Swiss-Prot record, chain A:
Summary of the function given for this chain in its UniProt record: Class II viral fusion protein. Fusion activity is inactive as long as E1 is bound to E2 in mature virion. After virus attachment to target cell via host MXRA8 and endocytosis, acidification of the endosome induce dissociation of E1/E2 heterodimer and concomitant trimerization of the E1 subunits. This E1 trimer is fusion active, and promotes release of viral nucleocapsid in cytoplasm after endosome and viral membrane fusion. Efficient fusion requires the presence of cholesterol and sphingolipid in the target membrane.
Domain of life: Viruses
Glycosylation sites: 43
Native species: Chikungunya virus (strain 37997)
Protein name per the record: Spike glycoprotein E1
From Swiss-Prot, chain B:
Post-translational modification: Palmitoylated via thioester bonds. These palmitoylations may induce disruption of the C-terminus transmembrane. This would result in the reorientation of E2 C-terminus from lumenal to cytoplasmic side.
Biological source species: Chikungunya virus (strain 37997) (CHIKV)
Identification of the protein by name: Spike glycoprotein E2
The protein's role, per its UniProt record: Plays a role in viral attachment to target host cell, by binding to the cell receptor MXRA8. Synthesized as a p62 precursor which is processed by furin at the cell membrane just before virion budding, giving rise to E2-E1 heterodimer. The p62-E1 heterodimer is stable, whereas E2-E1 is unstable and dissociate at low pH. p62 is processed at the last step, presumably to avoid E1 fusion activation before its final export to cell surface.
UniProt-annotated stretches for the region Interaction with host Mxra8 receptor: 2-8
Subunit structure: Interacts with spike glycoprotein E1. Processing of the precursor of protein E3/E2 into E2 and E3 results in a heterodimer of the spike glycoproteins E2 and E1. Spike at virion surface are constituted of a trimer of E2-E1 heterodimers. Interacts with 6K protein. Interacts with host MXRA8; this interaction mediates virus entry. The interaction involves 2 adjacent E2-E1 heterodimers.
Subcellular location: Virion membrane; Host cell membrane
Membrane topology value: Single-pass type I membrane protein
Lineage: superkingdom: Viruses
Positions bearing carbohydrate: 49
């Protein structure tokens, strides 16, 4: 006439602060460019969207 | 002590006065239905980033 009781549950690991993966949703992108121009015997550089 | 006309195979014994604390391993039975918490200790050696 003896009995035994057992129980368990699930938690989140401590290491999640270093080893993890992330899911993203993406939208329209922007663009940028950089150029070199030879102007009156000298090299100049430009940068713009 | 001594017990009169009471044979072996009919008795039980145990030690019950304790002064130190012990970890609650899943391989040892609980002393009471609701446990009595006394303290806690920490786990060393954390993680970090490195290169190999
Ligand atoms: C460096 O560690 C931090 C936390 O300690 C974490 O946020 C980061 O993602 C880690 N970087 C790499 C490259 O593992
Ligand atoms: C800079 O100008 C000279 C001409 O003066 C040219 O030969 C050179 O290629 C230019 N620099 C680069 C990185 O193209």
């Amino acid at each position: 006439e003896n009995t035994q009781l057992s129980e368990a549950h699930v938690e989140k690991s401590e290491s999640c602060k270093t080893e993890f993966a992330s899911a993203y949703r993406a939208h329209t992108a922007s663009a940028s460019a950089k150029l070199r121009v030879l102007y009156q015997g000298n090299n100049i550089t430009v940068a713009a969207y | 002590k001594v017990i009169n006309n009471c044979k072996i195979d009919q008795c039980h014994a145990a030690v019950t006065n304790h002064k130190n604390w012990q970890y609650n391993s899943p391989l040892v039975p609980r002393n009471a239905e609701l446990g009595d918490r006394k303290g806690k200790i920490h786990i060393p050696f954390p993680l970090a980033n490195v290169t190999c």
